[PDB]
Design a protein around this ligand. Structure first.
Ligand code: GDD
Ligand code: GDP
Ligand code: CL
Ligand code: CL
Ligand code: MG
Ligand code: MG
Lengths: 318, 317
């Protein structure tokens, strides 16, 4: 493969500039591949309509996306109606794989989407992007279509001068990756919502639910296809919606848990619970967040079970 | 001890308002204890003066700090001169424990200060605070003085509703503590630079050099004296710096490195290098930071070793 993250970063980082969409459209036509775009959507009424439009506008210049799926979290904001009125196929995350009960977050929606994706290639895109430029859809298709061994491509980009990701990327994922999965240290936006791979690949790895899904997918793909078969594409600028630091804390915990879970199955981490530690202190699903408030110090408690879905291949009608 | 972070939280969180300085001064005197205040300092000529001044004013009201140590990273802004001019003792981080060579960052300075601290208690204080109110000095002394079994006290506070700390604390320390050291999850500012413990405790644990020092101390104190012997005190509002996110990434890494190390030693973590990963990818002191710029993607590469100084006890006295 590649001797280092440095070597990979050399050979496997592209620019959307290198993949004009008419070329891709042509190449895609030649290969007879179809693409499904999947938009995990939760209260994005104000933005999905615009994204669906832009993908349609792009398909006019260059036929690249055959299916547009909005997988809705039963948003209270009318998201589903909005996406439907703009021409996307819309599904409820709770109606897909209904045998699994209600969806546990973004990861669960993304997994369940596989049950109705018809494309040879599955392309995930975030539904909340404000100013959606067309390369936020087609850029990552470049290397899958054009570079021989590449099976999985993640987006790279910058906040509208040097961007190393949002807070969770910078302070959680990158430090955890550098230490535990150094092979992934080369990725500019390892937690990006926009990335693409063949449907068969996604269908044959498990999916962490909740916010841990990207982290889990990075690790699982790395292990399945190898570093040389992953790539990234600079896509330019991408405005993302800032979250409250306090909520990001919970996301950071999900990323930690995903890494910890994987380390444990590799055997690098054993006896996760330190001996001598009374069981009462031990409950992974129980996140304690101590804060200071105008009226005193408080201990907030969040409970999120780390639910993991099996490779959908194993659980879905063949 | 306590049965959960929640029980600890109710029993070992206080408000500085519970500890009027004049009462602290009385108890300190009855117990014959002395307090050393260490200010690890690098380029803070603009703020040390104020801090030192506040401490001296506090002591007039209530004699609480017996020694003020500015341990200076040989700043070029004249930190040393200001501190000296304002009445504080001044030391070069490089001259203390010089057998270990020049100093590896903030932790090293804090460790080396243990060789010149005369107090029974040692109070570390950040020297870059813009608006130093009295309770930043005395608040954390409350529980060590007043609650016999308490040996270690961390500050708690909030920026100018709910505040769960700075970016590194929220996105790195607290996630990691919740998973691997649940006993520390009740701390509001576990990475706070204001904390106090008895000299003997500090002299009995190792100190990570650099940015990981607070994380290491939290963990090693926890293992050494137990969660019951730790406390926090609400000091009110403290204004915070806006370090750059790109710099904070290296800091988060140090924090992760520190936890990982402790996990290796406990046996929880082994074969840290994936069994099948070429040594070309394996260099813990080598942090790869991939970034996007106007000119394209760049892979930045920082280096900082993790250095652990042993307990000063093993080298001294
Ligand atoms: N169907 C569904 N969609 C969801 C859910 N939660 C979030 N989404 C959608 O998934 C997209 C991104 O989720 P964000 O909550 O906006 O994530 P982020 O703050 O932008 O942070 C980033 O890092 C995460 C780490 O994994 C990523 O998951 C995420 O994609 C994003 O890149 C958005 O379109 C959002 O509506 C859910 O529970 N169900
Ligand atoms: N003596 C010494 N002091 C330092 C060093 N680095 C930081 N400090 C001081 O430690 C305090 C906090 O520094 P810093 O780590 O930047 O604070 P933070 O970014 O808010 O966590 C300040 O008073 C700094 O001047 C160092 O290498 N040597
Ligand atoms: Cl787990
Ligand atoms: Cl769980
Ligand atoms: Mg977003
Ligand atoms: Mg817990």
């Amino acid at each position: 493969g590649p001797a280092s993250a440095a070597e990979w970063f050399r050979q496997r980082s592209y620019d959307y500039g290198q993949f004009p969409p008419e070329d891709l459209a042509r190449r895609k036509r030649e290969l007879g591949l179809t693409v499904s775009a999947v938009l995990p959507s939760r209260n994005v009424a104000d933005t999905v309509g615009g994204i669906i439009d832009e993908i349609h506008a792009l398909n006019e210049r260059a036929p690249l996306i055959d299916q547009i799926l909005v997988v809705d979290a039963d948003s209270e904001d009318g998201t589903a109606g909005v996406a439907a009125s703009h021409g996307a196929e819309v599904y409820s995350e709770n109606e897909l794989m209904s045998g699994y009960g209600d969806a546990h977050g973004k990861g669960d929606a993304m997994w369940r989407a596989l049950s109705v994706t018809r494309g040879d290639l599955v392309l995930y895109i975030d539904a909340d992007t404000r100013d959606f430029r067309p390369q936020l859809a087609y850029g990552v298709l470049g290397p899958v279509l054009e570079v021989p061994g590449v099976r999985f491509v993640k987006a790279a980009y910058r906040r509208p001068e040097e961007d190393g990701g949002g807070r969770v990327t910078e302070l959680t994922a990158k430090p955890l990756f550098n230490l535990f999965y150094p092979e992934l240290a080369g990725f500019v936006q390892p937690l990006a919502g926009e990335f693409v791979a063949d449907r068969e690949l996604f269908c044959s790895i498990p999916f962490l639910t909740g916010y841990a899904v990207e982290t889990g997918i990075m690790i699982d793909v790395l292990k399945k296809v190898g570093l040389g078969a992953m790539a990234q594409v600079d896509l330019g600028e991408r405005q993302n919606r800032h979250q409250h630091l306090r909520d990001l804390s919970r996301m950071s915990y999900a990323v930690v848990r995903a890494v910890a879970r994987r380390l444990r199955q590799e055997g690098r981490l054993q006896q996760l619970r330190e001996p001598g530690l009374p069981e009462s202190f031990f409950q992974l699903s129980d996140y304690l967040h101590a804060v200071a408030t105008p009226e005193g110090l408080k201990l907030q408690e969040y409970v999120e079970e780390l639910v993991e879905r099996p490779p959908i291949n194993e659980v879905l009608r063949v």
